[PDB]
């Protein structure tokens, strides 16, 4: 209570795959769509994937960003509560090249 619930407790997203909170973004949705949460580290650019050669593409898989590039995969997300600062920390850690990969459950 004294060290989260009334301090800096915050909800956030997490890529279930790579276990990160630093790359979880919103999906830039076409006008008349709901915003998804994907992982920028585990996703591919739509063009780069099309290079995988005889099946067909998929819809709910694709997701565009703000700049206007089309992406695919990395839609394995979840929600969890942590203290804000933890984010900040990881950021700085990653500024040295240290990644945190917190295996996320229930897998």
């Amino acid at each position: 209570d004294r060290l989260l619930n009334s301090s800096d407790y915050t909800q956030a997203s997490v890529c279930r795959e790579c276990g990160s909170i630093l790359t979880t973004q919103q999906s830039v949705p076409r006008i008349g769509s709901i915003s998804t949460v994907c992982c920028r580290r585990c996703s591919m650019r739509f063009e780069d994937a099309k290079k995988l050669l005889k099946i067909f593409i998929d819809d709910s898989q694709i997701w565009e960003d703000g700049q206007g590039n089309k992406f695919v995969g990395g839609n394995e997300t979840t929600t969890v509560a942590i203290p804000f600062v933890l984010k900040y920390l990881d950021s700085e850690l990653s500024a040295m090249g240290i990644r945190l990969r917190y295996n996320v459950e229930p897998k």
């Binding site: 279930r16 709901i34 979840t78 929600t79 229930p106």
Partner: protein, 58 residues
């Protein structure tokens, strides 16, 4: 929107999907329309229109 209150965090499929004939389909439509008798009502209303389609009607 989609909260954790009304939506599972994660779900998977045990087996593999299996094809079913039109018959089974109807007997299912029945049992499910009978069970449910709030937005559940505007939806099953869409079902009853498809069950009526599997016999030949508007």
């Amino acid at each position: 929107t989609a909260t954790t209150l009304n939506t599972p965090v994660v779900i998977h499929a045990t087996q593999l999907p299996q094809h079913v004939s039109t018959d089974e389909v109807l007997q299912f439509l029945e049992s499910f329309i009978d069970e449910k008798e709030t937005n559940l009502s505007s939806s099953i209303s869409q079902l009853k229109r498809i069950q009526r389609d599997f016999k030949g009607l508007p």
